C-alpha cells in the first residue's frame, strides 16, 4: 500500500498523520511520502496568525461546522499539556465588533463564554456599536508545521522536495492512493473552476503588550476585508487584506498602508510598535470544501484520489475534523479493495 | 508654601503630581521636593505585577470601593492613548479560581464583562470547583514609576536621596506641609502597631503564549498565599507568598519552590519557561488605608501633615484615588491657612 500525499501545510501534513497513526497497525507494507513544492517555512500555512474561527455566516456545507467543533475540542483538550509550546498552541481571548446588530454565530457554543459586548467595553472602541467576547484558541502555523514535520519523520514518513505535474505522473510511479492537498493551487492538477485566491497580506509587528484579539468586520468590504489584530507567542498580526483572483505573492505598498492605518485607528498604541516582517498569501476559497474520493482512471487499473483542499480562510481552525474525515475516506478504499 | 513629600514610590509620586497639578497656579511659591531613601527600580511599586483587583472582602473603610473605582475609570480611558506603553497600562482577562462557591465582590461592577466560569472552562482547571472570568488592566510599578519620575521632573519638583529621621527633622528645616507616603516602613516615624508587613516573592519567567492572568484563592492558607500566574508586558509574574510580620528581604528558596510547583500545577506549560528573575517585597499591611491629616507640635506653629500609607497589596489598585484625597485635604489646609 503506497500512499503519496501531495503537499506539506497544514492540511496535507495533517491528513499524512491522521493516516499513518490509524492504519499503520492494519496494513503490512504502509508507505507513505509527501510530495511538496514548498515546505514548512514558505507555505500559506506559515503566513496564517492560526486563530481559531470560521466564517460569519453558516457553512454551505454543515460539515463544515462538525469538523471546526472536532478541530476546537481536540486542540482544547491539549491547551494544557507540555506539547502545547512546542505546537505553538494557546488560549486567547478577543473582540469581535461590528456597526450594527448581526445574529450570534453557528460557533457560539463551542468557543469558551460567548457574549456580546457591554457599553463600558465599546467606548474603547467608537468606530463600532456592537461586538462579542470570547475565549478561543491559537494554532501558529509556523510551529504546528514544525511538530507535525517531526511527528511523521519518526513515523517512517519521507519527504520529497517536487513539484507534481499530474496526477498520471505519481501513479505510474507506484501510488495505490494519492491524497491531493495542494492548496489554491489544486487547479494546476485538475481544472477546478470554483477554487480561487483569496489573496492576504500581513503586518508582523512587536507589541506584546496587546493580549486580546480584534477583530473587525464590515459587508461593505467583505469578509477579512476589514482591520484586525491577532497577538502571537512573539509577535502580533496585523492584517485586514482579501482579493479574489490576485495571484501576485509580493508585498503591495498600498496594502501595507490599508493595514497600518486601519489597525492604528483601531488600536492607537500601535503607532509605535516597532514592524517585524510582512508576507503575502493565498486563501484556496472554495464555496465549500472539496473532501472526496475520486477514480483515477489511468491504465490497466486505475488509482485512488482523496482531494482534501478549498479551506479558505479557515484552515487552522478545521484542519483536524479534514483530517479525520479524509482518513475514514482511507478506510473505505481499503474494505473495497478487501484488506480490512 | 513649601511642601516635602516623603517616599517615591507610587503613593508619593502619584501623590505628589496630582497636587502640584492642582495647585501650582492657586499658590505663588509652591516648592515641592520629595525625599526618599529608594527610588524608582529599588522600591515595593517595582515588585508589583500591577494587576488592578481589589481584596476580595469588602474593606473596612467603604471609602476604598470609591478610591479603586476612581483609579480604575481613570486607568481605562487613558488605555488607547499613544502613552499606555509609556505608563504600562494595558487591558488583560483572566480566572479567579476557588474550591467552594463564594460571593460577587463589591468591585464587580467596576471590571469589564464579569461573570462566572462555565463547566468547559473549569475542566481546564481540575483542582477548583468554581471561579470568575474578566477583564482587567495592568500597570507595571517600574514603568509607571518612571513616568511619574519625568512628569514630575518636567514640572519642576526636585527629588532628593535622603533617609528622614523625624518629622520635626523636616519641619525644622522649613517645610510648611509634609506628605507621608513611607510605606511599610511609616511606623519608623510614628509608632503604628496596625502597620505589618505582607512579605511576598514573585518570579519573572519568559512564556510568552501567556495571555490571562490566573489567580486561585484559598480561605485555608490565606490572601495571595495561593499560586497565581501575571503575564507582564515583556515576562509573565509567578507568585502566591504572603507572610505576616516578615521583614527578610532576601529571596529564599522555599518560597522559590512553592511559587514554581504551585504554578505549574496550575499551568504545567510553565515547566519549560525560562527564569529571569526573582524579587521581595513588603505590602504594607493595615485594616484600612491611613489617608488622613494630623497637625505636628513642632515648635512655636506647628505644621501640617497628610498621611498617605498602608495599601497593602493593592496599591496600584487604589494609587489615583488617594492621591485625589490627599490633594483634597491639601485643599482644605490651603482654605483654613487664608491661602485658597
Ligand atoms: C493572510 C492570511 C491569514 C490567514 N489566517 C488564518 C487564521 O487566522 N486562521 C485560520 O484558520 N486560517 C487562516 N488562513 C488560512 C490558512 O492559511 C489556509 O486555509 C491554510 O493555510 C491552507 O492550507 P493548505 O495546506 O491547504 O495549503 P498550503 O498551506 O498553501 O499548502 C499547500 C501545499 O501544497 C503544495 N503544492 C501545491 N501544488 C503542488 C504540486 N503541483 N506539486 C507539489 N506540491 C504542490 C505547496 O508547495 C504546499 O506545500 C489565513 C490565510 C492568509 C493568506
Ligand atoms: C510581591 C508583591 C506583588 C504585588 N502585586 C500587586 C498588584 O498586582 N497590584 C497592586 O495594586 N499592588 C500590588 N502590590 C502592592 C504594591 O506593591 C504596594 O501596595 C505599593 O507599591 C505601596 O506603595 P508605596 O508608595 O506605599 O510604598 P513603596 O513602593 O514601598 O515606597 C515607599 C517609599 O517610601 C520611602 N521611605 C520610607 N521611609 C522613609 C524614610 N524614613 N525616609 C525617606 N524615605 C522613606 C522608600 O524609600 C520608598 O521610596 C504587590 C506587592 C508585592 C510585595
Redesign the interface.
Known amino acids: 500500500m503506497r500512499v503519496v500525499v501531495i503537499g506539506a501545510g497544514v492540511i496535507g501534513l495533517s491528513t499524512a498523520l491522521c493516516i499513518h497513526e490509524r492504519y499503520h497497525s492494519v496494513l503490512q507494507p504502509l508507505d507513505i511520502k509527501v510530495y511538496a513544492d514548498r515546505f514548512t517555512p514558505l507555505t500559506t500555512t506559515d503566513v496564517a496568525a492560526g486563530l481559531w474561527q470560521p466564517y460569519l455566516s453558516d457553512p454551505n456545507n454543515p460539515q463544515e461546522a462538525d469538523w471546526s467543533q472536532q478541530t476546537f475540542d481536540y486542540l482544547?483538550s491539549h491547551?494544557?499539556?507540555?506539547n502545547?509550546?512546542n505546537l505553538g498552541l494557546?488560549?486567547?481571548?478577543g473582540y469581535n465588533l461590528f456597526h450594527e446588530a448581526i445574529p450570534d454565530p453557528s460557533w457560539k457554543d463551542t468557543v469558551?463564554?460567548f457574549?456580546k459586548?457591554?457599553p463600558?467595553?465599546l467606548d474603547?472602541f467608537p468606530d463600532y456599536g456592537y461586538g462579542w467576547?470570547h475565549?478561543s484558541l491559537i494554532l501558529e502555523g509556523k510551529n504546528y508545521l514544525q511538530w507535525l514535520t517531526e511527528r511523521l519523520t519518526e513515523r517512517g514518513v519521507k519527504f520529497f522536495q517536487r513539484k507534481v505535474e499530474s496526477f498520471e505522473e505519481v501513479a505510474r510511479e507506484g501510488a495505490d492512493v494519492i491524497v491531493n492537498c495542494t492548496g489554491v493551487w489544486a487547479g494546476a492538477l485538475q481544472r477546478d473552476p470554483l477554487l480561487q485566491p483569496g489573496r492576504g497580506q500581513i503586518m508582523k509587528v512587536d507589541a506584546?503588550?496587546?493580549?486580546?484579539f480584534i477583530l473587525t468586520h464590515d459587508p461593505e468590504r467583505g469578509i477579512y476585508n476589514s482591520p484586525y489584530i491577532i497577538?502571537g507567542?512573539?509577535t502580533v498580526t496585523l492584517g485586514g487584506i482579501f482579493q479574489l483572483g490576485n495571484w501576485s505573492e509580493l508585498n503591495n505598498i498600498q496594502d501595507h498602508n490599508t493595514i497600518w492605518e486601519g489597525c492604528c485607528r483601531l488600536?492607537?498604541?500601535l503607532?509605535?510598535a516597532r514592524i517585524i516582517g510582512e508576507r503575502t498569501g493565498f486563501r484556496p476559497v472554495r464555496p465549500q470544501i472539496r473532501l472526496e474520493r475520486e477514480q483515477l482512471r489511468t491504465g490497466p487499473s486505475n488509482t485512488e484520489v482523496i482531494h482534501n483542499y478549498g479551506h479558505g480562510g479557515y484552515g487552522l481552525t478545521i484542519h483536524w475534523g479534514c483530517a479525520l474525515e479524509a482518513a475514514k475516506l482511507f478506510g473505505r478504499i481499503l474494505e473495497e479493495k478487501k484488506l480490512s
Not at 491547551?79 to 507540555?82: D, G
Not at 494557546?90 to 481571548?93: C, R, T, V
Not at 506584546?208 to 486580546?212: D, L, Y
Open positions: 482544547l491547551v494544557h499539556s507540555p502545547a509550546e494557546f488560549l486567547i481571548s469558551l463564554g457574549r459586548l457591554t463600558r467595553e474603547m467576547f475565549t506584546p503588550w496587546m493580549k486580546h497577538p507567542t512573539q488600536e492607537p498604541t503607532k509605535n
